[PDB]
Symmetry: C3
Subunit: 227 residues, 3 copies
């Protein structure tokens, strides 16, 4: 019986036997209700791609917790040079960790790491399919609509986190199409409202996806559900 908390933008914290955080953009995240000090003990950090609003505080959280960062090969190379413990994977690959299974899923996006004024290659972007005690969480990362999402329908995902903010990621209309492709038991919208460029009508998303038969739960930053 784990606690899954949305912390704003794309930050998702999973508290169970082990504690896992995805795309830990805490410092400088204007809708994040906690500071780094407010986080619990962290065991794993999952990073979907290199962009700073996802990579976030991964280095500091990992070092302060002796946590392992799970990401693609190229991002882990970058982090390794920062003195961070990593477990590299790549797109479509999966591994069984002490807490459960992680699979990196395809995304259509980019994965540059901005280090000073230099854009470093951070592999290709992903999402994560996480299986813990028979329960499945999908975090799509940053992505546009892609037919690769149809590969997830047979998984019978319990909770799918989908970006709806538009411009850099799917807007509301395409995220509805994604929800229909994936057919999760519940969908949670994310990556909206953080800046005005990614404003989204989240109430309209909930209304439209529920009309297609998929339950939607709107989590404000700091709110949680149990799996």
């Amino acid at each position: 019986g784990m606690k899954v908390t949305f912390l704003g933008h794309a930050v998702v914290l999973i508290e169970g036997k082990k504690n896992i955080i995805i795309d830990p953009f805490i410092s400088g995240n204007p809708v994040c209700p906690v500071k780094l000090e407010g986080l619990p003990k962290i065991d794993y950090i999952l990073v979907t791609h290199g962009h700073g609003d996802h990579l976030g505080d991964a280095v500091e959280i990992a070092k302060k917790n002796d946590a392992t960062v799970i990401s693609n090969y190229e991002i882990c190379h970058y982090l390794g040079k920062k003195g961070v413990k990593t477990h590299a994977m790549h797109i479509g690959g999966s591994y069984l960790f002490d807490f459960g299974r992680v699979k990196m899923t395809p995304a259509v996006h980019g994965s540059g790491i901005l280090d000073g004024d230099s854009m470093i290659y951070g592999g290709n972007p992903s999402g994560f399919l996480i299986t813990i005690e028979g329960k499945k969480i999908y975090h799509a990362g940053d992505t546009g609509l892609t037919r690769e999402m149809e590969l997830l329908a047979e998984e019978n995902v319990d909770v799918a986190f989908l970006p709806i903010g538009g411009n850099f990621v799917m807007d509301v209309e395409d995220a509805v199409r994604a929800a229909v492709m994936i057919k999760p038991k519940k969908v949670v919208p994310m990556h909206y409202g953080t800046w005005e460029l990614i404003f989204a009508d989240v109430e309209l998303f909930k209304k439209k996806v529920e009309e297609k038969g998929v339950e939607c739960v709107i989590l404000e930053p700091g709110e949680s559900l149990e799996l």
Copy 2:
């Protein structure tokens, strides 16, 4: 009632209330019928990926026009350091500009930026779906055949620009398959003939795609259609 002009290779100029150019490879483009001075006022420049035969003269055109370059996050970072005004997006994302909507579409290709002798990471490659006054133009950028194109069928695209030159991009046979996937009202072949490596039998493309029920319009560089 806009004027859409093919200027050779992958260069497409849209003249309406605002003027938009896609992949503005003008200087050094051996099939381009105009020089930079021959271009009209430009409001927007769309860049599908980092390769020089698409990025082209984007920097000079933007600075001489105070134009905005629309491209992915990584390419816009590169251009920003060149003093260019940008509006960053990423794959599958869309935004409503003063002239109409632009959506970046998935492509399967690469996006290196050659800066001197260094290959800079330019994100992931895209195409563009452009909606202006209810009319839709698809420019596929450089790409191979991908099932992501099937996402465009429901758009009822008016004009689709598809590469047919082979080697770096789809050849004639795969571009026919793409046309069948997308089902646009009209298809225009591009990215062929510019160099001998990308020779294509464009008359055979027209013949084969029309046998599948899709009207093909062959535009020589400098020729145009109205939308």
Copy 3:
């Protein structure tokens, strides 16, 4: 009547009128039964992506043979600076060489080139569809499961090499799904066992894919089949 030899990890050697090697990771490859000196004359080297366990000894093999390396634009740029003869292509593109046709196929993965301590951008990762005297070989490169593989079903591939090692690439279960998508006449598992991280139950793969109606041939490193 060509000889196709699996040399371990992802190394595939095709001996015919011309000799072709794919992802020539020889030196430092712990399951490779030959040393560089043990290779025959090489005419072409195909590199699916930038990762060192695939790029491998491409530079030394090419220079010692005056061989041409076929890969994406970005990888060929890197190799060109190493003094290597290249023929650049990109994803979905094809070209007819003196020995037959090569087409680069989509993969979902990454393509960083590790040069010293720097990660260089090596384009996007691919596989190869090779057509020689009417016979077709698919080498998927490193990849996760992707619907782009369904584009290959109509090719009636004779032999498909698929990664099954998990973590960085498809595991056994997803590779079975891939085999069903592609429907080749025979499948050969690869990219497993080389390190403990990519252990795979290869006998289980053979059993499961044959239950789906696809013949599987397990080649130990050094074993071959004729096409």
